[PDB]
Symmetry: C4
Subunit: 104 residues, 4 copies
């Protein structure tokens, strides 16, 4: 139980240590910027309550997928498709990062 906590602490430290890498900060900022754009787009174009627009943005960008709402306009559908790929681009970016910071 003591080793558990010490390992947890070293791990958390390593995690926060990653919140210092500039390229990671960019990916993060870019992710937040993308989530905001999505929240704005879906509330405006699909008429979703802001909180539901951020929610749809989140489940869509992280690839989790939504099983309750689906864009009704041809405009929302096009945007969502592009939105999915941006999210995949961001994920690869984070993954590439982890891979690089592991083989130095």
């Amino acid at each position: 139980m003591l080793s558990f906590l010490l390992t947890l602490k070293r791990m958390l430290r390593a995690c926060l240590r990653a919140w210092k890498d500039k390229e990671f900060q960019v990916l993060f900022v870019l992710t937040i910027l993308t989530l905001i754009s999505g929240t704005i787009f879906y509330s405006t174009v699909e008429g979703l309550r802001p909180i539901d627009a951020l929610y749809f943005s989140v489940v869509t960008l992280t690839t989790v997928g939504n099983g309750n709402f689906s864009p009704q306009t041809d405009f929302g559908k096009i945007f969502t498709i592009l939105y999915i790929f941006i999210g995949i681009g961001l994920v690869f970016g984070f993954i590439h990062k982890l891979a690089v910071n592991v083989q130095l």
Copy 2:
């Protein structure tokens, strides 16, 4: 085929060897803990039966997603959003771990 069996047993051994790594154990405990917290939350705030709260917590934290349930309260929605990123943080942790074991 004896080959297939031996190869599988080798892989199983390498797998059990992982469940011995302390960092992997932390990641595992943390997800079980996160899953329990999730179950509690959706039971309370969303009024779901425990088994449905665990189910939703699971399909959500694993990114599988569900096409049947959707949080009704703003609190439940905000929590789900953070829950998802915790899940992603957890997956990256496991992924980073498998990458380290590749050296």
Copy 3:
């Protein structure tokens, strides 16, 4: 266009070359075995038509997620949760593999 096809051929060869690795064959067999068990379970316990049981098994095991059907019995719900983790275990296995066969 010629380079394209030559790269495609080298890549395909490399792919088929992976269908020779014994550990990969095991993961594959294990995946097929798991999909069959799932098809049997969901058709039997949830009363799903076989084709719909394999389908649900597939979208669930690959984490794609289903937005039309959800287990109705407490038994199906427990199994699905365990099913999801087996699938994640299989994915990590395949990923660990790719990572190893890249850093030799």
Copy 4:
């Protein structure tokens, strides 16, 4: 911050550098091709409007999944199942690629 900008530009350059790799180009063309085939298939066999066939093809091949549409024919279901694995095969290809670029 000039730092942030320079770092982003560096990352963007490294990204464009990827779109120059032949193997990455093949993977990209193959997914666009797979996406088009998917659009054709769901338009024909499932009677979906082209834009809805592309949408479904996209949320399916990317593993995101959809909680609105579900194939009605047995042909559409069997195809979707193979479609998913093609998508996974494609993702592993990109992942394997990013791993190689780590050396």
